[PDB]
Predict the structure.
Amino acid sequence: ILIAMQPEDLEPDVDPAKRIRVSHHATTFTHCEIHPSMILGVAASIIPFPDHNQSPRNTYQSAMGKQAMGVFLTNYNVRMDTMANILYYPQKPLGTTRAMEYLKFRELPAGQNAIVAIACYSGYNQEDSMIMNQSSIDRGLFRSLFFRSYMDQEKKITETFEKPQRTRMKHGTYDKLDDDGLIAPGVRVSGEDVIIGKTTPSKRDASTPLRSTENGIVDQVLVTTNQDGLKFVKVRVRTTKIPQIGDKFASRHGQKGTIGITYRREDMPFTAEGIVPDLIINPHAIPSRMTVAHLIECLLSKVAALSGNEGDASPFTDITVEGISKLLREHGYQSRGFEVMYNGHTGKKLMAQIFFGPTYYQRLRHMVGLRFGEMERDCMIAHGAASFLKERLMEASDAFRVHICGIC
Amino acid sequence: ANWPLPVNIRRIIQNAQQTFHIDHTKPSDLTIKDIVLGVKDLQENLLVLRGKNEIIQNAQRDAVTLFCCLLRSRLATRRVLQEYRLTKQAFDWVLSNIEAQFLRSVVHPGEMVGVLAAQSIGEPATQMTLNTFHFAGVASKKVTSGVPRLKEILNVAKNMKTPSLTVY
Amino acid sequence: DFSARTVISGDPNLELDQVGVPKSIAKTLTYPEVVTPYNIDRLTQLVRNGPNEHPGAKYVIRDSGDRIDLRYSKRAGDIQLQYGWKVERHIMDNDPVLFNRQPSLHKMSMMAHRVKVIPYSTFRLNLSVTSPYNADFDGDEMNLHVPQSEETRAELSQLCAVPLQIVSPQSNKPCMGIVQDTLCGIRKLTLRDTFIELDQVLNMLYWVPDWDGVIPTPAIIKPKPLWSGKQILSVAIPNGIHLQRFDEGTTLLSPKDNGMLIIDGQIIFGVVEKKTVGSSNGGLIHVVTREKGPQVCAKLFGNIQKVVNFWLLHNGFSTGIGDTIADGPTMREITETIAEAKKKVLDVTKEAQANLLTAKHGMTLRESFEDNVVRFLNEARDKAGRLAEVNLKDLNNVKQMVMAGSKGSFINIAQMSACVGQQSVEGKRIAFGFVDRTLPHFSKDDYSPESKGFVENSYLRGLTPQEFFFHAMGGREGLIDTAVKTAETGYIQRRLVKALEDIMVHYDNTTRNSLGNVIQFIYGEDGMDAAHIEKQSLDTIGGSDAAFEK
Amino acid sequence: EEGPQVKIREASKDNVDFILSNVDLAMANSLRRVMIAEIPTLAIDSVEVETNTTVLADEFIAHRLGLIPLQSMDIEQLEYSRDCFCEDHCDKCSVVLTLQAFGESESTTNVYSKDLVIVSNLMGRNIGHPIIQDKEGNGVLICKLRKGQELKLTCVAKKGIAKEHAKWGPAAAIEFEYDPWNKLKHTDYWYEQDSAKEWPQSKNCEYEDPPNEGDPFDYKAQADTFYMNVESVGSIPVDQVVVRGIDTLQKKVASILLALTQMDQ
Amino acid sequence: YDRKVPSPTGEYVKEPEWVLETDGVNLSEVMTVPGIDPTRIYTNSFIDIMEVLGIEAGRAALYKEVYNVIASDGSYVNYRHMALLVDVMTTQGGLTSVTRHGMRCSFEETVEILFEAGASAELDDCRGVSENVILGQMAPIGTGAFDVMIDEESL
Amino acid sequence: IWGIGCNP
Amino acid sequence: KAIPKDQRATTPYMTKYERARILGTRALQISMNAPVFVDLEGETDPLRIAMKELAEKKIPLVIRRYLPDGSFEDWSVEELIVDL
Amino acid sequence: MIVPVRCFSCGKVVGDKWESYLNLLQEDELDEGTALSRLGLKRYCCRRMILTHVDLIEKFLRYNP
Amino acid sequence: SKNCYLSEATESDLYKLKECPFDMGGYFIINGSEKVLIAQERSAGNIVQVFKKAAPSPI
Amino acid sequence: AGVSQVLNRYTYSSTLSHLRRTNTPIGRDGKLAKPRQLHNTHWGLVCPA
Amino acid sequence: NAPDRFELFLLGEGESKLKIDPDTKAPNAVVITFEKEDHTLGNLIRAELLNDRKVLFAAYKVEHPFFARFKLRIQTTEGYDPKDALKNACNSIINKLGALKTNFETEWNLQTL
Amino acid sequence: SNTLFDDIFQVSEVDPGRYNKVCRIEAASTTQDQCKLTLDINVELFPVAAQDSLTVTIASTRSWRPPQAGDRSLADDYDYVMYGTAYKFEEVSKVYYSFGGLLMRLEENAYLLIRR
Ligand SMILES: [Zn+2]
Ligand SMILES: [Zn+2]
Ligand SMILES: [Zn+2]
């Protein structure tokens, strides 16, 4: 077959800001594409302006959207699944795609729109760290729920659920369990606490401690049976997670970063309207990632907010930086995204103006190996640190003292 | 003409010109003998090996051959007097500093130069080297290049991808 | 184990050789310190704070060898230390610890740092250790290891300490330099145009901690006391530093300012940037190391950082969409430059289709056809990117990063503003994966640039769907090759190490392997350490004979 | 009253738009910072959840409660709980409020800050009353309830500052500007063709003379005139946010004098 | 190619020369064709160089090759490091493979390697880190390439 | 992604 | 397999490894209440003390350097030059 | 889930604006830009808060219990 | 799937059944866990393919 | 082998994405056979990113 | 692993508001460590010190954003105690804010709401 | 102790390079046919037109104290004043100064005062 890309290619000045197209045409077309943006799968359908991104950065985003927190389903409260993450306050992205309509994104979104400044500001956001607003964090920015649920059965003669009392138990107290062997919703747990109290016949202890690095409150406890016999049990535990130094965050363009430090509003830099960034990323993360789309999203989203419209970020449309720039100018802002800013510490103007606007950011999972193998051994040899090498690689096996013949 | 060598004579000299506030508009009090003999003697002191036999003594002469070329070219009499304008005092300090920096540059017995070497070549090869070839092919066309090439080398591959003679 | 792992973040405010250790990790890792008169008070104090407070201690081992656990002991608050006892105490400020990032392919990747205990839960590194570790703070994690004896402490701090690794034997030059923000700021701070007011100067002065309290006289006394960017940076450079460099057309009056002259640690001229303060050559960091020693050098990193970062905080720096726009003018010219190459490619097609193209020797027609087309297309891209870079003006933020040397390159600017250019799989243009066509939107036997993946548009203008796909094709090829080393190289390095691992320099200057077989009669054929070796000019060798005689 | 001059252009129950003049930039700034950061204010600092049957988590709700602005007009009369000689909280240093809601309709039931009920003794200090500003006297939407769902809860409001947590900040934003014409050359305008054209003039260009082109750069001139606008979140009347802004700063500097005083004695 | 060559007056000057580049190798037979300069003939197959010119040539060519791979991507590595590799691969008189494959001492530790040690009468010099760990001692590398002992003549 | 003998 | 004080061909300079191991060996002894050999003008850290001793040439240790062929040269710490 | 109480970036009370903003849209039959200005949400930080809010509480409420 | 109960359930039915109206199906529930079958790509059958074979081969 | 997986539920679209995933099993001599590459004929059928 | 947030403004224990150290490298200079304070006092007090003519040096710095403390360095002309300059800079500030509060209060009562 | 130097120029070129506050001036003697002056000036604080003669003085520690006044003056009587280091007293065939990077040459280490 011969396929026309746009239906317009089936018919019979040039705006400088448009991308250049090449037709011929054609006269021999048998088919025409419904919409070119349709070559994308589900992940990539979410990237604004992927046609202005560097090829591989689209690929990185595609893996990253899969680690964003959002609202996986609306029935989240009634499922007891292994892990779950929910944003407190999901927002629809100011820059969307036409394909998002069918993907339910506006409906079950996975990020928020940060007011992001692109600035060198104090140096705590270098090599991809980020400066986040402690005060926006105070007020709800990126805060999320987290649920883990533990399971356990009885039997396979017998095991039973019960609070045991030393007649080989675990360190963390059994204090919080009721006598049926289970804590109960509302109880605040932490550290190593016994979440589930299990015994094997006097009594060998088989209870479930809470994951060492965690805490929270107990959310639901469910008691039930498998299709034959087993009384089993599932304990969901709730935790809230406040944005915090070392947490990971990414725009929709395949660059993550962590929070380097957090400033309170006072310490932040500010616009003359008194607007302040939720987030400060570094200029240096920009030139080389070839991440133009991110800049455009930002340009686009600022107009959206100012005008109350969804900004169309779909690939292969006729939307242009000049387009957006002219729209922004009408709102009385500097055409190209820049704003005059002042230094929080001091109130003095900055000698530079700052690219400043909204952008959609995703909170990614994970906070909450250590090893000395071949390659570390080699570094220490390269340093000729032989005592350290002896000490690290040895043992409490202590000097057995033996006697040896000098001849044999 | 630019080759890694120990002891940066140029800097030792700009130091001397600074420390001694060298008045460029006056005669030096250096004699010809001070320089020529001074410099000859300093070479006798750039020690890398110390054994007192004909063999180690030659090895030593070989070891500092290139450095001594550098040295004699920097401390040519005319060059010292007309270009650098050193005084007997400044000059004497240049010499002994070259000696001190020199001995300070000798490798220290106990250095694991092997792991050093491997790590020095390996880290760039995985730093990387990104690609691969480019590749090529057809047009212009080809010559394999590290890593696949590095691998051919370390393997001592009898069946090399793009063998080529250069004939002058 | 005596080790700990966690996420890392950068800290403008740590010294080069420091590591921020979260307090919570610092409580988990101990050092056994034998009790002496020199420390009995300190230890006594520590034992009293116990496991839960820092600086604390977790155990006290007495003579008999029995370990009193301070978490549970009846006598946690009632212990009276004897001499000879050991106190397993928490790590503390200035303990040498070994810090490392994986995979560690060379040795400036495990280095010894001095601890600085801090709140929050990430390890924190000075910006300039980033490069030797090949780290960045986008989720990277690192391992900290605590030496467990008096000899191993000494070993770390006298052989692995960060400052002792500044100049590296790998390439006989610094392996650490001023980077990122500090590089951006340092250029700007040092332009002739940068002037500072008295009020700001006093702050900056005060920020370099090894400052002698003497206010340098302003370069301008009247009409208003005013100080150079150069003047103040200079405070960070230690006395007795001399440096001299001549870039293209640098004169003793460097019209362009341009070059570099430092005398007695005062910047006489030249904008400080990557060739003066990066990990260069070179190079102020090379020079200070060699003249002043590793400690003084390592401190320079933080003095310059403190001073520059502060100046940058109040100057500010940003980049936006507008930095990628070319006034075009430039646009018209770029569009026309490409329209030109589509015409040379068309004219070669007509030629080769008439059967007029001659083959070369040892190349097909089609091969030598492709060759011409790829050279036209490449030089079109090339000169379109050049056109964009000249139009960028001094205030252009991307162009400023570039000039300072802090990221990125010509190519970057060019793809963004001018023209992405030719996609390629396996070193050829996009192949006919469909029968005689690359996509079903084309007719068969179409070797035009459009057809075979020249991307005409920049990222700024965005790609057409065809260019989008072909750019993905090229995309994937690079991803696959990244995935083939990881791990094809972590495997080479392991093989290289194994072959060489036992070579050592012996007290007779020979290098030998473990059997004692000679490998080099003198190491490197010159007996020298590569970390004390540097590019120098053999004058004797160039110029005419007339020049040499004179 | 020679010293920092104040004008004023708008003033309302929520914003005061004023011109500061005859002051060094630092002071305009420290006052700017304080108003954002250090003015004492009342806000819920502890929730005790008796029953929650809503679709929200307790701490989700607890978080929202702390964000409901409370009447803070008489807050100097309330003690910092941490200084109060009472065991935990009492009427000398805290306000206790109640929330009880049940959804007793097929229709969906809303819970607002108007449903909070002071239950502690206010000693007649004007403090604690949740701030209401919308046409129908509802205040903030805390929650939403389906039929049969329930929420019973006790909060303790306590005195605090923005530095400790942003729920205590009396102020919304603070617009701040000086030298609208760039006389002083404190900024350096990025441009493609002409900075004059591409950069919009601010409001405050009307209130100042544009420089005449035939002119040496004025090198002595300083930042001494500042165009501010303070927006109060309701918990204190605006005029107060500024006033008490100045006060807290005074108390802060004075407090440094008492320390110098105390290292003679 | 451009060739930097001294001029009759002494300065280096570019003298361009025609060179032939081939696909495939036969060093011994090409080397011998009239009209060429056989003192300059080169090939990237260091194996052929070692077989026609000998190991010392084999060595230098092996250096030029490892060097080019590194230089190919802009990077620079001090001479001695590649010099060392090239000497190890060359020191027994032929080209020993490195990566290939290829004490005591001790990971598997295939008892079968100790059996051959036994039947071979193999003598471990104990310089590795690993046999020194099994023995609980400091290895004779770097910091332990020497002994320390009490002085008994210092006042 | 740049041109032949550069990047894919 | 022992080579006389007058025919030593090894370096008169202490190596960086020698210094590390000497400083570490003395440190350990200082760290264990072993008598000290200098005025600690404020010093309380065994390694810093160890360095004072080296500086002032009062560490009574000898370095036995092994040649590849098993012979060895003995140099006192007191003797060796410390420039690095 | 529901209207946040305050705007993340500046702290304006915004949680009292949601019902009115719904009303402005459906019964006054206004557009979103004008709607938000009529609510005095000038700063684009504040605009974002209401304009992009997604009121999932309305779905959670449909669960039985 | 036609067979599953949720195949012809109104939106209101789904809420009563504690199933999100946004859940899209296409997976199994085995012993409590949700499992997908990843599409396995294979070459088609009944297709004539010709291929060259590199020089050491007799074919 | 690997054919049935535990369904993703991190975010909604992560779920969708997972239900639309394809895999190519490899081996028994994979060659010759450039399966990793984005083929021209994937246009419209399989996401390029 | 986060500290309590009240530590930005609440002193101690063991801690006092001001540490004064007598500098070293300069005659008549002083270095004051202010505890539980930030750029609000820092920039202020300094800026005012700089209107004193008998002050040849004033500067402050927050050494690390984590902790709330700043160091402030005052050098003065001989026979003038830096501790008195601080005093005077303070008093000078106490006034100017008084002046300002009152002026603002005045302008406020003029307003029609 | 003392005025090192005193003459009159006679500007002949105002080059702004690629700067905004700084200009590189080319002058010439109003006495000696031979004897030039290249010099960088803050053209913001002391604008300079082109032709445009000004009397230039070179003249002549330890810290820095703001003025002050009354009061004294090493030499008040000028508009522009700079301070800098002599860095190359040099070749010829018949002196260089740095002012924290504003350069000057006259075809240790002191003051430069100007009027107009
Ligand atoms: Zn025997
Ligand atoms: Zn109370
Ligand atoms: Zn807002």
About this structure: Residues D 84, 86, 89-90, 92-93 surround zinc ion (ligand 2) (CB under 6 Å). The longest strand of chain A covers residues 215-225. Residues 42-73+90-143+243-369 of chain A form a domain with the Dna-directed Rna Polymerase Ii 140kd Polypeptide; Chain: B; Domain 6 fold (CATH 2.40.270.10). Residues 13 and 20 of chain A are 13 Å apart (CA to CA).
